[PDB]
Amino acid sequence: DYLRELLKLELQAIKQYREALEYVKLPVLAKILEDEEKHIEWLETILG
Amino acid sequence: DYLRELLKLELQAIKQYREALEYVKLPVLAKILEDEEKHIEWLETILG
Ligand SMILES: [Mn+2]
Numbered sequence: 823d824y825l826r827e828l829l830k831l832e833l834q835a836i837k838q839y840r841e842a843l844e845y846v847k848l849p850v851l852a853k854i855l856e857d858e859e860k861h862i863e864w865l866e867t868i869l870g
Numbered sequence: 871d872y873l874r875e876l877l878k879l880e881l882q883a884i885k886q887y888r889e890a891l892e893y894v895k896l897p898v899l900a901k902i903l904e905d906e907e908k909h910i911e912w913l914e915t916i917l918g
């Protein structure tokens with residue numbers, strides 16, 4: 823639930839990085855996004 | 871500044887994952903933390 827606080831936290835970071843990537847096409851950003859996508863898998867795996 | 875919103879966002883995620891790792895010693899968590907540490911480098915590099 824602390825694990826649910828974490829997943830929403832990632833879920834927000836991906837919304838904002840996506841958007842960040844929307845206007846500033848910077849490779850470093852697609853990569854951070856890659857990782858946050860994996861963060862999300864891993865937490866939803868540990869949960870439900 | 872959108873890049874500053876991102877860094878605080880990571881800076882918080884590392885506070886909470888550290889803490890999350892404090893009580894539930896789960897390897898997946900030290901690894902997420904590893905990545906967030908790198909997220910932070912990369913953004914402070916792009917900034918100041
Ligand atoms: Mn993450």
Ligand SMILES: [Mn+2]
Binds near residue numbers: 880905906
């Ligand atoms: Mn991150």
